Design a binder for this molecule. Structure first.
Ligand SMILES: CNCCCN1c2ccccc2CCc2ccccc21
Ligand SMILES: CNCCCN1c2ccccc2CCc2ccccc21
Ligand SMILES: CNCCCN1c2ccccc2CCc2ccccc21
Ligand SMILES: CNCCCN1c2ccccc2CCc2ccccc21
Ligand SMILES: [Cl-]
Lengths: 158, 157
């Protein structure tokens, strides 16, 4: 999976909206509480070059928040979120101003992938979705979801 | 959108649901979701109607359902109900490999679409999925699923 060249995380800081998601397995995304059904509300780069994700997810009939620190590696667009190196964040592309494309990747067994198209403003951006679909063309996706602007403004995209 | 020169005698026989898409995430986001239905068979009637033999997951088992799509004055457009709220639109087929169709509902407040890519054998057909993806580019879909060959053989499960 080819990641972005020359990523500057200092330029991705701020509030984002999960506009579209795709995954390698239907059960990762289909249910309201599916394991990879997580909404990115904020990206915070650290001075050390880590990227904090502020996530929301539906659990037990409520919206819950979680911070995930993705730690820097030798590749600037590849981050690790476990000490066992099975689970990664891959940044595929961004223009910084409008959209960011990233994947959660698990390579422990069958690779697992869950990818998102983030936008800076809670509107549909057809350019961002086109770039998302082109980025995914090489990957073995079996489910895609896309959200409307009303959903983008609500906790857990209700 | 709907194809020219449909011959319903040639769509007869065994199919498999390779891919599904819908206008609303809640139509497809569970085995229990209303549009999560697998086509087993199409049967043309002598009167030019098309019977859909369907399976749906209910409480951990496949339940079978037959819907009659009755012919209308527009080719490749079939009505399911007497009130004309529910329709089958046949978009395209080559008869021998794939069939693309959509269920449509126009009850207020919002129109619903749920489309499928059917294939003749329980194998992944990238050409069929590409034709399905091109057909969907014009429609306002918010969820899409495709099945692997294990899922294609195991019906609703
Ligand atoms: C018990 N189920 C685990 C999933 C919960 N999860 C949450 C919770 C709220 C928002 C996002 C996430 C995603 C990842 C994560 C990471 C660590 C603990 C819980 C969670
Ligand atoms: C694969 N086990 C955890 C499933 C959810 N998970 C995913 C999903 C796909 C690929 C990788 C990962 C690991 C990290 C992660 C982070 C936040 C939510 C879900 C997930
Ligand atoms: C493996 N490539 C499949 C490409 C088309 N496909 C997409 C597209 C983007 C994200 C996910 C998917 C998987 C399911 C699917 C279903 C129906 C039409 C296209 C697609
Ligand atoms: C709750 N909506 C109707 C139930 C599902 N339904 C759909 C779904 C989307 C669009 C049209 C229709 C029409 C009828 C029909 C027929 C067979 C399976 C599902 C559906
Ligand atoms: Cl979608």
């Amino acid at each position: 999976t080819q990641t972005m060249k020359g990523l500057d995380i200092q330029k991705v800081a701020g509030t984002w909206y999960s506009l579209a998601m795709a995954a390698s397995d239907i059960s990762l995304l289909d249910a309201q509480s599916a394991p990879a059904r997580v909404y990115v509300e904020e990206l915070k780069p650290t001075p050390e070059g880590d990227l904090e994700f502020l996530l929301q997810k539906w659990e037990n009939g409520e919206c819950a928040q979680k911070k995930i620190i993705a730690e820097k590696t030798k590749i600037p667009a590849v981050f690790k979120i476990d000490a066992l190196n099975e689970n990664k964040v891959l940044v595929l592309d961004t223009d910084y101003k409008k959209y960011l494309l990233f994947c959660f990747e698990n390579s422990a067994e069958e690779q697992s992938l869950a990818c998102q198209c983030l936008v800076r403003t809670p509107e549909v951006d057809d350019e961002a979705l086109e770039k998302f679909d082109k980025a995914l063309k090489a990957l073995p996706m079996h489910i895609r979801l896309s959200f409307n602007p009303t959903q983008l403004e609500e906790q857990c995209h209700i």
